[PDB]
């Protein structure tokens, strides 16, 4: 967000007194040959460099930052830029003209948090979930305490699938997405229909089934035993996921050999 300001403005002096002096490597005999007008319009630069006025540049180094995180929309950085320039062209001083400098050489460096924001989704995945888990009932359900293993598999899923896995709080009911596409929106305040079977050995509306199928991959010997339903189903969903991988590769193979066809004797 700065070199995009460098690569939007500011067309050096070492590179100029490295060429006039003929200290380059590839073609030293470069500056000598130019017309004796250029060679007298580049020698009086690396002999008495001309000052500059950097405000615009680093101000453009701030706009290109805002509009890349999300404030000032892409189409408004022609009013924001003028407004910022005129503000910093009023109150300017070594005061502000520096306070910028720090802002521009910190905003491009203090981007690690932003990177973190999208590397553990600690923006709407764990802060939301670790909020929703605090809206759950007490952590002592009656039947079993396979509860905690499931509720931890949920956190692991949300933390190890950065894709989007956003956890909205679309009003009273917090709902889990499986991707920004969102074609597996399962309601996470509607598994207070699993605070039923948390411990037993057709009452699951697929919404609950959707959550089970969504996390299952991330369950191993955790939700465990023959803890009824919740146990097996998870195991059966994992088995079905493996079989689905098998059938996926099989169908690609059988359609690369060559119409419903494979879809029948696969499904």
């Amino acid at each position: 967000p700065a070199m995009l300001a460098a690569l939007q403005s500011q067309p050096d002096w070492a590179a100029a007194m490295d060429r006039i002096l003929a200290l380059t490597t590839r073609n030293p005999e470069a500056f000598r040959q130019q017309p004796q007008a250029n060679r007298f319009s580049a020698i009086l630069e690396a002999v008495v460099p001309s000052r500059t006025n950097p405000t615009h540049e680093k101000v453009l180094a701030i706009v290109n930052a805002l509009t890349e995180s999300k404030a000032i929309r892409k189409d408004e950085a022609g009013l924001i830029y003028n407004a910022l320039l005129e503000r910093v062209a009023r109150y300017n001083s070594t005061n502000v003209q520096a306070n910028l400098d720090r802002l521009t050489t910190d905003v491009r460096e203090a981007v690690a948090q932003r990177e973190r924001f999208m590397h553990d989704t600690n923006l709407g995945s764990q802060v939301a979930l670790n909020a929703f888990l605090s809206t759950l009932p007490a952590n002592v359900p009656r039947g079993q305490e396979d509860y905690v293993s499931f509720i931890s598999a949920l956190r692991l899923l949300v933390a190890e699938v950065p894709q989007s896995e956003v956890y909205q709080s679309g009003p009273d009911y917090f709902f889990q997405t499986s991707r920004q596409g969102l074609q597996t929106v399962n309601l996470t305040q509607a598994f207070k229909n699993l605070q039923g079977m948390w411990g037993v050995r057709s009452l699951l509306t697929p919404n609950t089934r959707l959550l089970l199928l969504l996390i299952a991959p991330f369950t191993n010997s955790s939700t465990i035993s023959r803890d009824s339903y919740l146990g097996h189903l998870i195991t059966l969903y994992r088995e079905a996921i493996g079989q689905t991988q098998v059938d996926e590769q099989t169908f690609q193979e059988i359609t690369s050999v060559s119409d419903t066809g494979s879809l029948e004797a696969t499904l």
Partner: protein, 178 residues
Amino acid sequence: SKEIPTPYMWSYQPQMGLAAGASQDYSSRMNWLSAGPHMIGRVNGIRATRNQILLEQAALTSTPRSQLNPPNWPAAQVYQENPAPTTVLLPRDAEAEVQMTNSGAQLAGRSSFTPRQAYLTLQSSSSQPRSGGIGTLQFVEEFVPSVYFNPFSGAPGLYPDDFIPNYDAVSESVDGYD
């Protein structure tokens, strides 16, 4: 809101290979208001089986992607045409002809002058493989009927926003001039 939802069918544009629009199953649906809770409990469940079939045949036929209707399919997930090396049997000995025509008087109204003959196996497929747009026999393979297990329940952002026909995924905006 709902849960056994009624899959959102995908429309086609025989033009640019990418798909077009999307909408709940406009027509194919039963009318159970003339039914009591003995088959309204089975229509509910036949539709669920339909949803599960759609899910399986989506995860088994589609090629996992990140955007429902990509604006330009990459050049490696679009079915390419790999024809066979064409082999033309070059039907003469050039040296032999030119030689005899210069010599003697042959004006030459296999070959008799020389028993030489060679194929010229060429390449047949293309130079740069196709990039943008899939054919019909790929539409019915990629965009399986999409099941939306919950309605537009979220912020504007997260919302299958490849469904609205008037979407320009390039600029994430609804087109205009209509």
